[PDB]
Amino acid sequence: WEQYRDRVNMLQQERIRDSPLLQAAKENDLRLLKILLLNQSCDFQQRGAVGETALHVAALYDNLEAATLLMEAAPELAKEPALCEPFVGQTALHIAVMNQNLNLVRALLARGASVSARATGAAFRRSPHNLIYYGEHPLSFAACVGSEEIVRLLIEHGADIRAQDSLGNTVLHILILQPNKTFACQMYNLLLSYDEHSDHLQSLELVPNHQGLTPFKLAGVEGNTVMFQHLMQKRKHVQWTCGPLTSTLYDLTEIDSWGEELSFLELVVSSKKREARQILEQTPVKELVSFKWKKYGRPYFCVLASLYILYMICFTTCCIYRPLKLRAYVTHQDNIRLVGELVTVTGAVIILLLEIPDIFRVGASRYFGQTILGGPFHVIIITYASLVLLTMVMRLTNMNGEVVPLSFALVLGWCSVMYFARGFQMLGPFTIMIQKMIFGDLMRFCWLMAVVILGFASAFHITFQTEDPNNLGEFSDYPTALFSTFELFLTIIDGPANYSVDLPFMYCITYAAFAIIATLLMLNLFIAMMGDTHWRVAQERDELWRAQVVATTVMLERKMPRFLWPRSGICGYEYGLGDRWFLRVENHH
């Protein structure tokens, strides 16, 4: 409802026009402005629908002569907030900081000011239908514009740093949502120099938000990479540099696991934003995960695939015997016939026993089953789990059949094995493009192919009913006619033909008209097919391939036993360095 906000904006700009006693500061009046304030007691009594006063329009643009003489009439006129609903609690300076007019700040500070007044306006929250998000306190509004010395001023009158908004946002992590670099790189250093000077206890960069998240990792998953670059020079310590060779060490007390089950490895694959895929760019991450996948990833990722592919060939093989009397069992083959599914019942309970907790860890299917990188393949994993139970609902009431839902389930079940097809030296990006464009361009012609075939079917059905179903027998009745022309569009079976004394009149030219559409429309599927790989997604299938490896190793580390996983790097102990657990990669120029 942006037009609901647009209801109240133009009310003020001619309400100041209506009453002729207050708007003269907006249009730089001097001589008549010095007349109206002394003859009447009408200085403070002018309030708009917002709660508007004479200083906010004087700081709309800088009215230097307007804010000069009104302190003689009312010096307390600045310290009143606004009262309307979209601008609840917002005062005089709150517009006079984003103007970056340093000649304006000498007046209203020494003549009565209060920096602790926060700005709780309704147009100030983070929202998709609101453009800017600049924070709560005017220190944050000074930090957003990127001015170096006016932010010098308000600190020198007892400014607080640790104050947040109603949704827990401090002064620091509002920089990483804003895309500019050239002012956020320099302002970060001298503002972090003005700490408590007892910095490790009640740390200002370790205090969580209202969600409870350490504000450095917001920059990690929203991926403004220059902060991820710039904080790594505070942790750097050189060891030896010899010519074009140098050494470096890697501190990863935050890049770890068991951090109260809120590590960023859980959450870098959780974002739905497109820039966030390339956070694997710099050396603290990429050579770490490349060692973690080479040392423990590949020699364990294949053995469960082996024990799965021999699981399902056994369940496939044992189900080629189950119809036995459809056209009470004690024989010799009945023992292996029994254990063939007595294995798969305790093998089929585990596929829900391991796949319900990651469902209620997320909380909803709307944040589980949409990710391309996490994998939409779970929709067949969940329906493989129910068939076995259903297979058992038949043997309490003894209904006939119940191998036809098995027929409809076993193919999809067998198709499930290709989710571990990504872990090889190859074959990864081949299965990514198909899942990328089933949703993309297979959807198009499936809404146009069903709508074109049934008119063909009705035109074919209305003609051959004047003759017998014995001479041709292909187009008999309504259900098989649409099926016959639907599969006849795909040039699978040859068109029907007979040569006798009976011959239909209309069928030939409409068959040619069907062929003149089947010779180009099925091939116009191929051009919408082809237009994606050439320029559209040619770069997409490799970065997703190098992101599924960190996805599957973070998903696999949090389920397997501790015995199979130590943490990488070096020990650090026997050396008086503390519990910091460094790491080396070697760089060359």
Residue of 45, 211, 239, 539 interacting with its own copies (CB under 8 A):
239
Among the candidate windows 28-36, 44-52, 217-225, 517-525, which touches its own copies by CB under 8 A?
517-525
The option from its own copies, ligand ECL, none interacting with 130 (CB < 5 to 8 A, set by class) reads none
The option from its own copies, ligand ECL, none interacting with 491 (CB < 5 to 8 A, set by class) reads its own copies
Count of C-beta atoms within a 10 Å radius of residue 69: 12
Three-state DSSP state, 245: strand
Q: How far is the CB of 532 from ligand ECL (least distance, A)?
A: 16
Token pair of 192 as six digits: 């972090």
Q: How far is the CB of 46 from its own copies (least distance, A)?
A: 18
Identify which of residues 161 and 380 has a Cβ nearer to its own copies in the complex: 380
How many residues form the binding site for its own copies (CB under 8 A)?
A: 111
Greatest extent of the chain over all pairs of C-alpha atoms, in Å: 116
Q: How far is the CB of 434 from ligand ECL (least distance, A)?
A: 6
Identify which of residues 38 and 245 has a Cβ nearer to its own copies in the complex: 245
Name residues contacting its own copies, limited to 534-573 (CB under 8 A): 534, 538, 570
Residue of 281, 510, 543, 560 interacting with its own copies (CB under 8 A):
510
Identify which of residues 445 and 545 has a Cβ nearer to its own copies in the complex: 445
Integer angstrom CA distances of residue 589 from 233, 238, 242, 244, 249: 18, 16, 11, 5, 17
The option from its own copies, ligand ECL, none interacting with 75 (CB < 5 to 8 A, set by class) reads none
What's the alpha-carbon Rg for the chain, to the nearest Å?
36
Q: How far is the CB of 459 from its own copies (least distance, A)?
A: 5
| 101 touching its own copies, by CB under 8 A | no
Residue of 35, 64, 206, 443 interacting with its own copies (CB under 8 A):
443
Backbone angles phi, psi at 396, to 5 degrees: -110, -25
29 is in an annotated binding site: no
Which residue matches tokens 């643009």? 61
| 127 touching its own copies, by CB under 8 A | no
| 511 touching its own copies, by CB under 8 A | yes
Binding pattern for the stretch 146-185 against its own copies, x by CB under 8 A and - elsewhere: ----------------------------------------
Identify which of residues 272 and 295 has a Cβ nearer to its own copies in the complex: 295
Q: Contact, 66 vs 58, CB < 8 A?
A: yes
Identify which of residues 38 and 390 has a Cβ nearer to ligand ECL in the complex: 390
Count of C-beta atoms within a 10 Å radius of residue 173: 20
Beta strands 241-242 and 245-247, pairing class: antiparallel
| 478 touching its own copies, by CB under 8 A | yes
Q: Contact, 506 vs 467, CB < 8 A?
A: no
The option from ligand ECL, its own copies, none interacting with 380 (CB < 5 to 8 A, set by class) reads ligand ECL
CA 317 to chain CA centroid, Å, is: 42
Helices (H), 422-575: 430-438, 442-446, 450-464, 478-488, 507-518, 521-531, 540-543, 545-557
| 579 touching its own copies, by CB under 8 A | no
The option from its own copies, ligand ECL, none interacting with 435 (CB < 5 to 8 A, set by class) reads ligand ECL
Residue of 316, 335, 365, 386 interacting with its own copies (CB under 8 A):
316
Q: What is d(CA 320, CA 316) in angstroms, rounded to the nearest whole number? A: 7
The H or E element spanning position 352 is helix 350-353
Q: What is d(CA 423, CA 296) in angstroms, rounded to the nearest whole number? A: 12
| 454 touching its own copies, by CB under 8 A | yes
Identify which of residues 110 and 404 has a Cβ nearer to its own copies in the complex: 404
Q: What is d(CA 286, CA 297) in angstroms, rounded to the nearest whole number? A: 15
Chain positions contacting ligand ECL, by CB under 6 A:
380, 412, 415, 434-435, 513
Pick from 145, 206, 198, 201: nearest CA to 170:
206
Q: What is d(CA 165, CA 218) in angstroms, rounded to the nearest whole number? A: 17
Three-state DSSP state, 110: helix
The option from ligand ECL, its own copies, none interacting with 534 (CB < 5 to 8 A, set by class) reads its own copies
Q: What is d(CA 344, CA 387) in angstroms, rounded to the nearest whole number? A: 11
Q: What is d(CA 438, CA 486) in angstroms, rounded to the nearest whole number? A: 20
Q: Contact, 108 vs 96, CB < 8 A?
A: yes
Identify which of residues 215 and 428 has a Cβ nearer to its own copies in the complex: 428
CB within 8 Å of 215: residues ≥ 6 apart: 170, 172, 173, 205, 207, 208, 209
User: Residue 588 region, left (φ>0) first, then alpha (ψ -120 to 50), else beta?
Assistant: beta
Name residues contacting its own copies, limited to 391-430 (CB under 8 A): 403-404, 406-408, 410-411, 413-415, 417-418, 421, 426-427, 430
Q: How far is the CB of 322 from ligand ECL (least distance, A)?
A: 21
- The DSSP secondary-structure symbol of 241 reads E
| 4 touching its own copies, by CB under 8 A | no
| 497 touching its own copies, by CB under 8 A | yes
The option from ligand ECL, its own copies, none interacting with 466 (CB < 5 to 8 A, set by class) reads its own copies
Binding pattern for the stretch 326-355 against its own copies, x by CB under 8 A and - elsewhere: xx----------------------------
Residue of 147, 270, 271, 458 interacting with its own copies (CB under 8 A):
458
Per the annotation, binding residues are 494
Per the annotation, binding residues for Ca(2+) are 494
